[PDB]
Design a protein around this ligand. Structure first.
Ligand code: HEM
Length: 137
């Protein structure tokens, strides 16, 4: 289920983080507009770029923590407040996070593996709701 999925993802976090974040950027190419540097780069090149490797790992490191602290796929309000109040996320709306999670769920559906994709779908909507409540536009 959801908790085992966090363990599966953490077991190979660099590869899963890169694969899911590339799935997000390829599904929603307009999202690169938050990432000027990423324009005109294939996947294997993005994987070569420091701000990409670095961002992508910190994203999934912190998302796995938020997932781990959740009860029944409902994140802590504190984890939502902390994401909203990150200076780097100033330009972001809940729409950015929704799309990440849509891409994550699609990725899990398409994998060979017994991910609990419905739990991730709920986790994504519950995180979007929490972010709104904590003040994200
Ligand atoms: C659960 C989802 C996410 C988490 C946990 C997260 C976490 C973080 C963290 C920890 C940083 C700072 C990392 C560092 O300084 O090394 C950061 C920066 C940033 N995040 Fe996010 N992020 C998330 C989703 C997003 C999304 C969906 C976008 C855009 C669609 C985004 C755009 C950025 C940008 C532009 C920066 C700073 C510049 C850069 O990416 O290099 N983040 N994020």
């Amino acid at each position: 289920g959801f908790k085992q999925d966090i363990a599966t993802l953490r077991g190979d976090l660099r590869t899963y983080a890169q694969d899911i974040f590339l799935a997000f950027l390829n599904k929603y190419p307009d999202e690169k507009r938050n990432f000027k540097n990423y324009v005109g780069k294939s996947d294997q090149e993005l994987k070569s770029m420091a701000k990409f490797g670095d961002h992508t790992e910190k994203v999934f490191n912190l998302m796995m923590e938020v997932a781990d602290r959740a009860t029944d796929c409902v994140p802590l309000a504190s984890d939502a407040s902390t994401l909203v109040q990150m200076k780097q996320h100033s330009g972001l709306t809940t729409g950015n996070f929704e799309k990440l999670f849509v891409a994550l769920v699609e990725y899990m559906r398409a994998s060979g593996q017994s991910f609990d994709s419905q739990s991730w779908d709920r986790f994504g909507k519950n995180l979007v709701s929490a972010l709104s409540s904590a003040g994200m536009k």
